[PDB]
Amino acid sequence: VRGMNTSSAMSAFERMEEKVLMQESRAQALGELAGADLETQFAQLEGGSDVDDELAALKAQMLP
């Protein structure tokens, strides 16, 4: 209960709880580094642009 050198529960948390979050943080950190490109932000614009340029065509073909 107090916390001995090799307490099964407490010692397990030291390596599990800590490392697990470390990897999780790395994913976000490394993931944000790969998403810093300015061309990826242009793709977002494309998506919004593509849905409005096709809409007109879609509405034009469906009209008749």
Binding site: A9, E17, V20, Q23, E24, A27, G31
Partner: peptide, 27 residues
């Protein structure tokens, strides 16, 4: 109740690990 809480952590921890491990190769 303390040992019952440990069981709950197992599932959550593994889900976070696998998810992070799956993104470690993709990235």
């Amino acid at each position: 109740s303390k040992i019952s809480e440990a069981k709950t952590k197992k599932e959550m921890l593994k889900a976070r690990i696998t998810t992070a491990k799956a993104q470690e190769q993709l990235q």
